[PDB]
Short mmCIF file of C-alpha atoms and ligand atoms in Angstrom, two decimals:
data_model
loop_
_atom_site.label_atom_id
_atom_site.label_comp_id
_atom_site.label_asym_id
_atom_site.label_seq_id
_atom_site.Cartn_x
_atom_site.Cartn_y
_atom_site.Cartn_z
CA UNK X 9 -304.04 93.16 18.54
CA UNK X 10 -300.79 93.85 16.91
CA UNK X 11 -302.46 96.40 14.11
CA UNK X 12 -304.30 98.57 16.81
CA UNK X 13 -301.03 99.80 18.28
CA UNK X 14 -299.80 103.45 18.16
CA UNK X 15 -295.99 103.49 16.91
CA UNK X 16 -295.28 104.74 20.32
CA UNK X 17 -296.60 101.74 22.06
CA UNK X 18 -295.07 99.47 19.03
CA UNK X 19 -291.71 100.86 20.03
CA UNK X 20 -292.28 100.55 24.18
CA UNK X 21 -293.56 96.91 23.30
CA UNK X 22 -290.54 95.87 21.70
CA UNK X 23 -287.95 97.38 23.83
CA UNK X 24 -289.91 96.04 26.80
CA UNK X 25 -289.34 92.39 25.42
CA UNK X 26 -285.41 92.70 24.75
CA UNK X 27 -283.88 89.94 25.62
CA UNK X 28 -280.91 89.74 28.43
CA UNK X 29 -277.56 89.92 27.30
CA UNK X 30 -275.60 86.88 28.43
CA UNK X 31 -272.25 86.14 29.83
CA UNK X 32 -270.03 83.08 28.57
CA UNK X 33 -267.88 80.28 30.76
CA UNK X 40 -258.25 79.71 22.15
CA UNK X 41 -258.14 76.70 20.55
CA UNK X 42 -260.59 75.72 17.62
CA UNK X 43 -262.49 73.28 19.78
CA UNK X 44 -262.62 75.28 23.10
CA UNK X 45 -263.57 78.64 21.33
CA UNK X 46 -266.55 76.74 19.13
CA UNK X 47 -267.47 75.15 22.60
CA UNK X 48 -267.88 78.48 24.00
CA UNK X 49 -269.85 80.50 21.01
CA UNK X 50 -272.66 77.43 20.74
CA UNK X 51 -273.07 76.90 24.18
CA UNK X 52 -273.54 80.72 24.15
CA UNK X 53 -276.15 80.55 21.53
CA UNK X 54 -277.87 78.09 22.67
CA UNK X 55 -278.75 79.92 26.05
CA UNK X 56 -279.76 82.60 23.49
CA UNK X 57 -282.25 80.36 21.50
CA UNK X 58 -284.48 80.23 24.85
CA UNK X 59 -284.46 83.96 25.21
CA UNK X 60 -285.16 84.86 21.70
CA UNK X 61 -288.04 81.94 21.89
CA UNK X 62 -289.66 83.69 24.53
CA UNK X 63 -288.92 87.31 23.10
CA UNK X 64 -290.38 86.33 19.96
CA UNK X 65 -293.67 84.94 21.45
CA UNK X 66 -293.64 89.00 23.11
CA UNK X 67 -293.06 90.48 19.23
CA UNK X 68 -296.58 91.74 18.78
CA UNK X 69 -298.29 89.56 15.93
CA UNK X 70 -296.24 86.47 16.44
CA UNK X 71 -298.65 85.03 19.12
CA UNK X 72 -301.87 85.33 16.48
CA UNK X 73 -299.64 82.98 14.10
CA UNK X 74 -299.91 79.13 13.86
CA UNK X 75 -297.84 77.35 16.11
CA UNK X 76 -296.47 75.47 12.96
CA UNK X 77 -295.86 79.05 11.33
CA UNK X 78 -294.00 80.38 14.50
CA UNK X 79 -291.86 77.27 14.25
CA UNK X 80 -291.01 77.83 10.73
CA UNK X 81 -290.49 81.59 11.13
CA UNK X 82 -287.87 80.90 14.20
CA UNK X 83 -285.99 78.06 12.48
CA UNK X 84 -285.11 80.60 9.34
CA UNK X 85 -284.09 83.79 11.15
CA UNK X 86 -282.63 82.31 14.39
CA UNK X 87 -279.10 83.01 13.05
CA UNK X 88 -280.21 86.21 11.87
CA UNK X 89 -281.56 87.39 14.82
CA UNK X 90 -278.61 86.08 16.83
CA UNK X 91 -276.53 88.46 14.29
CA UNK X 92 -277.87 91.62 14.34
CA UNK X 93 -277.74 91.51 18.17
CA UNK X 94 -274.16 90.61 18.22
CA UNK X 95 -273.65 93.57 15.65
CA UNK X 96 -275.61 95.78 17.85
CA UNK X 97 -274.00 94.92 20.88
CA UNK X 98 -270.56 94.97 19.30
CA UNK X 99 -271.53 98.64 17.70
CA UNK X 100 -269.54 100.76 20.35
CA UNK X 101 -266.52 98.20 20.14
CA UNK X 102 -264.80 98.92 16.91
CA UNK X 103 -262.82 96.23 15.11
CA UNK X 104 -264.50 94.00 18.06
CA UNK X 105 -267.19 91.69 18.09
CA UNK X 106 -269.08 91.70 21.71
CA UNK X 107 -270.25 87.55 21.54
CA UNK X 108 -270.58 88.34 25.78
CA UNK X 109 -269.28 91.29 28.06
CA UNK X 110 -266.73 89.04 29.57
CA UNK X 111 -266.34 87.13 25.32
CA UNK X 112 -264.72 89.99 23.13
CA UNK X 113 -263.15 88.78 20.15
CA UNK X 114 -261.02 90.68 17.75
CA UNK X 115 -260.17 89.39 13.80
CA UNK X 116 -256.98 87.87 14.96
CA UNK X 117 -259.00 85.37 16.69
CA UNK X 118 -261.40 84.61 14.24
CA UNK X 119 -258.63 82.16 12.77
CA UNK X 120 -259.05 80.20 15.56
CA UNK X 124 -264.45 81.86 10.17
CA UNK X 125 -262.53 84.82 9.21
CA UNK X 126 -264.68 85.35 6.41
CA UNK X 127 -267.80 85.82 8.20
CA UNK X 128 -266.18 87.72 10.87
CA UNK X 129 -264.96 90.43 8.89
CA UNK X 130 -268.71 90.81 7.34
CA UNK X 131 -270.08 91.31 10.86
CA UNK X 132 -267.42 93.89 11.81
CA UNK X 133 -268.56 95.79 8.38
CA UNK X 134 -272.13 95.55 9.84
CA UNK X 135 -271.52 96.75 12.89
CA UNK X 136 -269.57 100.04 11.35
CA UNK X 137 -272.42 100.65 9.21
CA UNK X 138 -274.83 100.87 12.03
CA UNK X 139 -272.25 103.47 13.93
CA UNK X 140 -271.80 105.34 10.45
CA UNK X 141 -275.54 105.81 10.51
CA UNK X 142 -275.55 105.85 14.23
CA UNK X 143 -278.37 103.19 14.60
CA UNK X 144 -280.59 104.10 17.44
CA UNK X 145 -281.99 101.20 19.74
CA UNK X 146 -285.46 101.92 19.09
CA UNK X 147 -284.81 101.01 15.10
CA UNK X 148 -282.82 98.17 16.06
CA UNK X 149 -285.46 96.41 17.57
CA UNK X 150 -287.82 97.42 14.72
CA UNK X 151 -285.23 95.66 12.55
CA UNK X 152 -285.01 92.65 14.76
CA UNK X 153 -288.85 92.24 14.44
CA UNK X 154 -288.61 92.52 10.70
CA UNK X 155 -286.20 89.83 10.26
CA UNK X 156 -288.11 87.64 12.60
CA UNK X 157 -291.75 87.99 10.35
CA UNK X 158 -290.03 88.41 6.71
CA UNK X 159 -287.34 85.81 6.21
CA UNK X 160 -289.41 82.61 6.27
CA UNK X 161 -292.97 84.21 5.06
CA UNK X 162 -292.38 82.85 1.57
CA UNK X 163 -292.31 78.87 2.69
CA UNK X 175 -299.55 85.45 4.85
CA UNK X 176 -301.67 88.58 4.66
CA UNK X 177 -301.44 88.98 8.23
CA UNK X 178 -297.59 88.80 8.14
CA UNK X 179 -297.58 91.99 5.56
CA UNK X 180 -299.92 94.01 7.67
CA UNK X 181 -297.51 93.71 10.70
CA UNK X 182 -294.86 94.45 8.52
CA UNK X 183 -296.30 97.53 7.21
CA UNK X 184 -296.85 98.61 10.67
CA UNK X 185 -293.15 98.17 11.60
CA UNK X 186 -292.59 100.15 8.47
CA UNK X 187 -294.91 102.81 10.04
CA UNK X 188 -293.13 102.72 13.29
CA UNK X 189 -289.58 103.32 11.48
CA UNK X 190 -291.00 106.22 9.51
CA UNK X 191 -292.38 107.86 13.08
CA UNK X 192 -288.91 107.02 14.71
CA UNK X 193 -287.10 109.33 12.04
CA UNK X 194 -289.80 111.89 11.75
CA UNK X 195 -289.18 112.58 15.69
CA UNK X 196 -285.49 112.76 15.15
CA UNK X 197 -286.05 115.52 12.63
CA UNK X 198 -285.34 114.23 9.47
CA UNK X 199 -286.74 115.74 6.20
CA UNK X 200 -289.19 113.15 4.37
CA UNK X 201 -286.27 112.61 1.92
CA UNK X 202 -284.23 111.55 4.82
CA UNK X 203 -286.66 109.67 5.90
CA UNK X 204 -287.13 107.26 2.93
CA UNK X 205 -283.21 106.89 2.28
CA UNK X 206 -282.49 105.92 5.65
CA UNK X 207 -285.49 103.55 5.55
CA UNK X 208 -284.07 102.07 2.18
CA UNK X 209 -280.26 101.91 3.76
CA UNK X 210 -281.64 99.90 7.09
CA UNK X 211 -283.32 97.35 4.71
CA UNK X 212 -280.73 96.99 2.66
CA UNK X 213 -278.33 96.16 5.51
CA UNK X 214 -281.21 93.19 6.07
CA UNK X 215 -279.99 91.58 2.66
CA UNK X 216 -276.31 91.30 4.30
CA UNK X 217 -277.45 89.83 7.35
CA UNK X 218 -279.16 87.42 5.26
CA UNK X 219 -276.15 86.64 3.43
CA UNK X 220 -273.97 86.12 6.57
CA UNK X 221 -276.54 83.57 7.86
CA UNK X 222 -276.52 81.63 5.10
CA UNK X 223 -272.74 81.48 5.10
CA UNK X 224 -272.68 80.82 8.84
CA UNK X 225 -275.05 77.91 8.17
CA UNK X 226 -273.30 76.02 5.82
CA UNK X 227 -270.14 76.53 8.25
CA UNK X 228 -271.95 74.96 10.89
CA UNK X 229 -273.19 71.66 8.90
CA UNK X 230 -269.80 71.22 8.10
CA UNK X 231 -268.07 71.80 11.38
CA UNK X 232 -270.32 70.14 13.36
CA UNK X 233 -271.77 67.14 11.54
CA UNK X 238 -270.67 68.60 20.14
CA UNK X 239 -273.73 70.86 20.11
CA UNK X 240 -277.01 70.84 21.92
CA UNK X 241 -280.37 68.76 20.27
CA UNK X 242 -281.98 72.08 20.31
CA UNK X 243 -279.21 74.01 18.12
CA UNK X 244 -279.07 70.83 16.08
CA UNK X 245 -282.83 70.96 15.58
CA UNK X 246 -282.23 74.32 14.14
CA UNK X 247 -279.91 73.11 11.64
CA UNK X 248 -281.88 70.26 10.36
CA UNK X 249 -284.04 72.31 8.77
CA UNK S 3 -289.44 68.82 18.13
CA UNK S 4 -287.73 70.48 21.00
CA UNK S 5 -288.89 73.88 19.46
CA UNK S 6 -292.60 72.96 20.02
CA UNK S 7 -291.86 72.57 23.73
CA UNK S 8 -290.30 76.01 24.50
CA UNK S 9 -292.97 77.77 22.51
CA UNK S 10 -295.69 76.25 24.43
CA UNK S 11 -293.80 77.21 28.03
CA UNK F 10 -274.31 110.59 -12.92
CA UNK F 11 -275.63 112.10 -10.02
CA UNK F 12 -277.40 115.21 -11.50
CA UNK F 13 -279.79 113.47 -13.40
CA UNK F 14 -283.68 113.83 -13.02
CA UNK F 15 -285.73 110.77 -11.86
CA UNK F 16 -287.62 111.09 -15.06
CA UNK F 17 -283.94 110.79 -16.88
CA UNK F 18 -282.95 108.14 -14.35
CA UNK F 19 -286.00 105.52 -15.40
CA UNK F 20 -285.11 106.12 -19.12
CA UNK F 21 -281.96 105.56 -18.84
CA UNK F 22 -282.46 102.21 -17.05
CA UNK F 23 -285.13 101.30 -19.28
CA UNK F 24 -283.20 102.12 -22.51
CA UNK F 25 -280.16 100.03 -20.91
CA UNK F 26 -282.35 96.71 -20.59
CA UNK F 27 -280.75 93.62 -22.06
CA UNK F 28 -282.54 91.71 -24.62
CA UNK F 29 -284.76 88.20 -23.85
CA UNK F 30 -282.83 85.62 -25.18
CA UNK F 31 -284.23 82.31 -26.63
CA UNK F 32 -282.53 78.53 -25.53
CA UNK F 33 -281.77 75.95 -27.92
CA UNK F 34 -284.43 73.70 -26.19
CA UNK F 35 -286.49 71.46 -28.63
CA UNK F 36 -289.95 69.91 -27.29
CA UNK F 37 -289.27 66.84 -30.13
CA UNK F 38 -287.06 65.61 -27.22
CA UNK F 39 -287.13 65.40 -23.28
CA UNK F 41 -283.03 64.34 -19.02
CA UNK F 42 -282.15 66.37 -15.66
CA UNK F 43 -279.08 66.47 -17.81
CA UNK F 44 -279.95 68.13 -21.12
CA UNK F 45 -282.39 70.39 -18.89
CA UNK F 46 -279.29 71.40 -16.81
CA UNK F 47 -277.21 72.18 -19.79
CA UNK F 48 -279.76 74.54 -21.02
CA UNK F 49 -280.30 76.56 -18.15
CA UNK F 50 -276.70 77.03 -18.06
CA UNK F 51 -276.24 77.73 -21.49
CA UNK F 52 -279.06 80.51 -21.00
CA UNK F 53 -277.53 81.83 -18.11
CA UNK F 54 -273.86 82.03 -20.03
CA UNK F 55 -275.29 84.23 -22.80
CA UNK F 56 -277.16 86.30 -20.63
CA UNK F 57 -274.20 87.19 -18.51
CA UNK F 58 -272.64 88.41 -21.91
CA UNK F 59 -275.40 91.31 -21.82
CA UNK F 60 -275.62 91.70 -17.96
CA UNK F 61 -271.74 92.80 -18.02
CA UNK F 62 -272.93 95.44 -20.91
CA UNK F 63 -276.29 96.31 -19.01
CA UNK F 64 -274.03 96.97 -15.82
CA UNK F 65 -271.61 99.36 -17.38
CA UNK F 66 -274.94 101.74 -18.42
CA UNK F 67 -276.16 101.95 -14.85
CA UNK F 68 -275.34 105.17 -13.76
CA UNK F 69 -272.69 105.30 -11.07
CA UNK F 70 -271.31 101.90 -12.09
CA UNK F 71 -269.08 103.38 -14.66
CA UNK F 72 -267.44 105.91 -12.17
CA UNK F 73 -266.08 102.89 -9.69
CA UNK F 74 -262.61 101.17 -10.21
CA UNK F 75 -262.54 97.91 -12.37
CA UNK F 76 -261.74 96.03 -9.16
CA UNK F 77 -265.04 97.04 -7.43
CA UNK F 78 -266.90 96.50 -10.95
CA UNK F 79 -265.76 93.17 -11.09
CA UNK F 80 -266.41 92.27 -7.63
CA UNK F 81 -270.18 93.55 -7.59
CA UNK F 82 -271.04 91.28 -10.58
CA UNK F 83 -269.56 88.02 -9.57
CA UNK F 84 -271.30 88.55 -5.90
CA UNK F 85 -274.87 89.78 -7.42
CA UNK F 86 -274.71 87.99 -11.03
CA UNK F 87 -277.57 85.28 -10.03
CA UNK F 88 -279.60 87.87 -8.21
CA UNK F 89 -279.98 89.97 -11.31
CA UNK F 90 -280.67 86.76 -13.53
CA UNK F 91 -283.12 85.67 -10.58
CA UNK F 92 -284.94 88.77 -10.49
CA UNK F 93 -284.92 89.15 -14.31
CA UNK F 94 -286.77 85.47 -14.68
CA UNK F 95 -289.08 86.12 -11.97
CA UNK F 96 -289.93 89.56 -13.97
CA UNK F 97 -290.49 87.87 -17.12
CA UNK F 98 -292.43 85.35 -15.47
CA UNK F 99 -294.80 87.67 -13.57
CA UNK F 100 -298.02 87.12 -15.58
CA UNK F 101 -297.30 83.34 -15.85
CA UNK F 102 -298.53 82.13 -12.82
CA UNK F 103 -297.28 78.55 -11.53
CA UNK F 104 -294.71 78.72 -14.35
CA UNK F 105 -291.17 80.39 -14.64
CA UNK F 106 -290.35 81.59 -18.03
CA UNK F 107 -286.94 81.14 -18.09
CA UNK F 108 -287.05 82.06 -22.10
CA UNK F 109 -290.12 82.70 -24.76
CA UNK F 110 -289.67 78.82 -25.49
CA UNK F 111 -288.41 77.68 -22.07
CA UNK F 112 -291.40 77.68 -19.79
CA UNK F 113 -291.39 75.40 -17.02
CA UNK F 114 -293.57 74.33 -14.23
CA UNK F 115 -293.18 73.43 -10.49
CA UNK F 116 -293.25 69.59 -11.88
CA UNK F 117 -290.49 69.68 -14.21
CA UNK F 118 -287.99 71.36 -11.71
CA UNK F 119 -288.67 68.14 -9.90
CA UNK F 120 -286.43 66.27 -12.28
CA UNK F 121 -283.43 68.13 -10.83
CA UNK F 122 -282.64 67.37 -7.53
CA UNK F 123 -283.22 69.80 -4.66
CA UNK F 124 -283.84 72.77 -7.03
CA UNK F 125 -287.74 72.70 -6.10
CA UNK F 126 -287.07 74.38 -3.29
CA UNK F 127 -285.37 77.27 -5.50
CA UNK F 128 -288.35 76.74 -8.13
CA UNK F 129 -291.06 77.43 -5.52
CA UNK F 130 -289.29 80.31 -4.18
CA UNK F 131 -288.67 81.62 -7.70
CA UNK F 132 -292.44 80.83 -8.30
CA UNK F 133 -293.36 82.80 -4.94
CA UNK F 134 -291.44 85.69 -5.50
CA UNK F 135 -292.82 86.05 -8.97
CA UNK F 136 -296.76 85.91 -7.58
CA UNK F 137 -295.76 88.57 -4.94
CA UNK F 138 -294.49 90.43 -7.70
CA UNK F 139 -298.15 90.10 -9.35
CA UNK F 140 -300.36 90.94 -6.44
CA UNK F 141 -298.01 93.97 -5.94
CA UNK F 142 -298.40 94.81 -9.57
CA UNK F 143 -294.92 96.04 -10.00
CA UNK F 144 -293.91 98.31 -12.89
CA UNK F 145 -291.54 98.04 -15.00
CA UNK F 146 -289.84 101.61 -13.75
CA UNK F 147 -289.78 100.08 -10.08
CA UNK F 148 -288.15 96.90 -11.58
CA UNK F 149 -284.89 98.36 -13.39
CA UNK F 150 -284.85 100.43 -9.95
CA UNK F 151 -284.94 97.22 -7.84
CA UNK F 152 -282.57 95.53 -10.22
CA UNK F 153 -279.71 98.42 -10.20
CA UNK F 154 -280.09 98.44 -6.32
CA UNK F 155 -279.24 94.75 -6.55
CA UNK F 156 -275.91 95.47 -8.60
CA UNK F 157 -274.81 98.25 -6.09
CA UNK F 158 -275.61 96.62 -2.77
CA UNK F 159 -275.17 92.94 -2.80
CA UNK F 160 -271.15 93.52 -2.78
CA UNK F 161 -270.88 97.12 -1.11
CA UNK F 162 -269.98 95.62 2.29
CA UNK F 163 -266.59 93.86 1.34
CA UNK F 164 -266.01 96.91 -0.59
CA UNK F 171 -261.44 101.93 -0.78
CA UNK F 172 -263.83 103.90 1.39
CA UNK F 173 -265.02 106.82 -0.02
CA UNK F 174 -265.78 105.32 -3.65
CA UNK F 175 -268.09 103.12 -1.43
CA UNK F 176 -269.46 106.73 -0.30
CA UNK F 177 -270.29 107.34 -4.06
CA UNK F 178 -271.97 104.31 -4.29
CA UNK F 179 -274.13 104.92 -1.23
CA UNK F 180 -275.02 108.40 -2.69
CA UNK F 181 -276.31 106.92 -5.90
CA UNK F 182 -278.45 104.10 -4.01
CA UNK F 183 -280.04 107.37 -2.25
CA UNK F 184 -280.69 108.87 -5.62
CA UNK F 185 -282.43 105.38 -6.63
CA UNK F 186 -284.37 105.48 -3.52
CA UNK F 187 -285.65 108.83 -4.41
CA UNK F 188 -286.22 107.54 -8.05
CA UNK F 189 -288.53 104.84 -6.23
CA UNK F 190 -290.53 107.36 -4.41
CA UNK F 191 -290.80 109.86 -7.23
CA UNK F 192 -292.76 107.12 -9.38
CA UNK F 193 -294.70 106.07 -6.10
CA UNK F 194 -295.69 109.49 -5.59
CA UNK F 195 -296.81 109.93 -9.14
CA UNK F 196 -298.98 106.60 -9.02
CA UNK F 197 -301.48 108.79 -6.69
CA UNK F 198 -300.06 106.95 -3.30
CA UNK F 199 -300.00 108.68 -0.19
CA UNK F 200 -296.73 109.25 1.59
CA UNK F 201 -297.63 106.29 4.24
CA UNK F 202 -298.64 103.95 1.16
CA UNK F 203 -295.32 104.99 -0.75
CA UNK F 204 -293.21 104.29 2.37
CA UNK F 205 -294.97 100.92 2.79
CA UNK F 206 -294.46 99.83 -1.06
CA UNK F 207 -290.80 101.22 -0.64
CA UNK F 208 -289.94 98.45 2.36
CA UNK F 209 -292.23 95.89 0.70
CA UNK F 210 -290.12 96.04 -2.74
CA UNK F 211 -286.80 95.93 -0.66
CA UNK F 212 -287.52 93.37 1.74
CA UNK F 213 -287.87 91.40 -1.53
CA UNK F 214 -284.19 91.53 -2.04
CA UNK F 215 -283.58 89.60 1.06
CA UNK F 216 -285.64 86.61 -0.43
CA UNK F 217 -283.50 87.23 -3.95
CA UNK F 218 -280.55 87.12 -2.13
CA UNK F 219 -281.43 84.06 -0.19
CA UNK F 220 -282.28 82.28 -3.20
CA UNK F 221 -278.87 83.06 -4.81
CA UNK F 222 -276.99 81.64 -1.89
CA UNK F 223 -278.87 78.71 -2.35
CA UNK F 224 -278.61 78.85 -6.03
CA UNK F 225 -274.59 78.79 -5.58
CA UNK F 226 -274.58 76.05 -3.04
CA UNK F 227 -276.22 73.59 -5.58
CA UNK F 228 -274.24 75.13 -8.51
CA UNK F 229 -271.12 74.07 -6.49
CA UNK F 230 -272.26 70.46 -6.19
CA UNK F 231 -272.67 69.80 -9.83
CA UNK F 232 -269.58 71.41 -10.56
CA UNK F 233 -267.33 68.36 -8.66
CA UNK F 234 -270.18 66.27 -9.47
CA UNK F 235 -269.81 67.15 -13.37
CA UNK F 236 -273.51 66.99 -14.14
CA UNK F 239 -270.59 74.41 -17.34
CA UNK F 240 -269.08 77.24 -19.27
CA UNK F 241 -265.78 79.18 -18.50
CA UNK F 242 -267.36 82.58 -17.67
CA UNK F 243 -269.59 81.13 -15.12
CA UNK F 244 -267.41 78.67 -13.63
CA UNK F 245 -265.15 81.69 -13.44
CA UNK F 246 -268.22 83.39 -11.02
CA UNK F 247 -268.28 80.48 -8.93
CA UNK F 248 -264.79 80.12 -8.03
CA UNK F 249 -265.00 83.65 -6.34
CA UNK W 3 -260.32 86.17 -16.64
CA UNK W 4 -263.25 86.55 -18.69
CA UNK W 5 -265.03 88.82 -16.50
CA UNK W 6 -262.02 91.38 -16.81
CA UNK W 7 -261.99 91.41 -20.57
CA UNK W 8 -265.88 91.62 -21.14
CA UNK W 9 -265.68 95.13 -18.89
CA UNK W 10 -263.40 97.24 -21.05
CA UNK W 11 -264.78 96.68 -24.61
O1 7EO E 301 -271.09 83.88 14.90
S1 7EO E 301 -271.62 82.46 15.35
C1 7EO E 301 -272.63 82.33 16.76
C2 7EO E 301 -273.05 83.31 17.74
C3 7EO E 301 -273.41 83.07 19.13
C4 7EO E 301 -273.94 84.24 19.76
C5 7EO E 301 -274.58 85.23 19.23
O2 7EO E 301 -274.58 86.21 20.03
C6 7EO E 301 -274.11 85.31 18.06
C7 7EO E 301 -273.64 84.61 16.85
CL1 7EO E 301 -273.59 85.13 15.58
C8 7EO E 301 -272.57 80.82 17.43
C9 7EO E 301 -271.68 80.09 15.97
C10 7EO E 301 -270.77 81.06 15.29
C11 7EO E 301 -270.04 80.88 14.05
C12 7EO E 301 -268.69 80.02 14.19
C13 7EO E 301 -268.00 79.58 13.36
C14 7EO E 301 -268.36 79.87 12.10
O3 7EO E 301 -267.32 79.49 11.02
C15 7EO E 301 -269.39 80.62 11.88
C16 7EO E 301 -270.05 80.69 12.71
CL2 7EO E 301 -271.86 81.72 12.05
O1 7EO E 302 -282.54 79.25 -11.95
S1 7EO E 302 -281.05 79.02 -12.67
C1 7EO E 302 -279.87 77.97 -12.46
C2 7EO E 302 -280.20 76.89 -10.91
C3 7EO E 302 -278.63 77.76 -13.23
C4 7EO E 302 -279.25 79.21 -14.04
C5 7EO E 302 -280.68 79.64 -13.72
C6 7EO E 302 -281.09 80.91 -14.45
C7 7EO E 302 -281.08 80.96 -15.94
C8 7EO E 302 -281.65 82.30 -16.61
C9 7EO E 302 -282.31 83.46 -15.91
O2 7EO E 302 -282.52 84.20 -16.79
C10 7EO E 302 -282.06 83.30 -14.62
C11 7EO E 302 -281.79 82.14 -13.63
CL1 7EO E 302 -282.11 81.70 -12.07
#
């Protein structure tokens, strides 16, 4: 059913499935406890958001698991980067949890990369309809190598992304150039995720059983 | 497998 | 650098291609440590050619030396892997590290942990084959990795020059696929398909660094490659 | 620094 959508109903489906913006409840132990507790509550909503991504439900349960395990930190980062957009120099983890680069000490390497990505989304003026498409691509792409249905849905999100830029009035050159600029950002989100995974493995091994389960993979 | 449980509910 | 035609863009990249090197591998003899030294010695000699190849990429020469150093030490393994993936395109099930160094998945099991990287490299090579990637699109993708893998970390209006060069290579990719008889929809899809590969090449590189930083202390390498790791 | 020397030939 994911293949039969018009790019308009593909956009309306992703925006309707958008997860909420949760709240949090500065030593190195207290700040870590707040972020991991916030990320654990966000994992539950992302799981229900993933099932509402068209084409994800049609997959094997084991394939649903592998895609979510490979990209859960990427999804959390592009969401943070998106929420933190109109807050330059700041990362909006939660509406009550706004941290600066100085608080990054107690991480600061990944913190500046997240600030650099948010500044890039503002420079390009990334729209929300493009953001939910990029977030869906991350879900299906980052784990498809460890499939013929996945790439057919990936091509559709590409058709949906090109349609969004065509409606805004960009020439064909401006469309595939902006298309390339958006997808090349996903290589940096992948890079930030892997650099975050290796810190959590070192820093942790009190975290939840669910979040620990995501790391043992 | 806790992820199995949430994907079913 | 910016006023070259897309036809002139591909010829400049295709002319700047580094050579294919051989290894000192001899099948009179088989070790996991000996096989590790062959991959490291081969990668070290390829880095010398890559440094000269990067200087011939349009837009790379205009950047400051500090930025040229930063782009290479952040993407050197990505360039090596996509080159290995390209050389192994039509050798399904095997990785063509060198014309004499052709390994399969069973020999990647001698070294620990590298099987995941090995099968991921194999999956990327099979992906290029089922897509039937052309050499003109390959030299474009490799040039994208050089200019993109370390651009976010960084004096700002040299970065704006980097994005302008990236925009031209994108048009060069669209230009080639428009000449191969594909519709604009098929061009946008293939353009998106190719750039999504780089997310996995980026992933394999980060996994390669983490494994390269384990045998470093364990002492199971060159001075140039050790400088790339200490960065 | 070898990467610096090989870039200025
Ligand atoms: O960004 S983090 C994070 C998070 C939480 C809620 C979010 O919405 C997004 C993120 Cl990225 C939980 C733990 C993080 C983390 C904390 C410390 C560190 O050195 C590295 C990382 Cl990746
Ligand atoms: O896989 S590799 C590796 C582990 C160290 C050097 C490698 C390598 C060596 C040469 C080459 O062309 C490509 C690569 Cl990835």
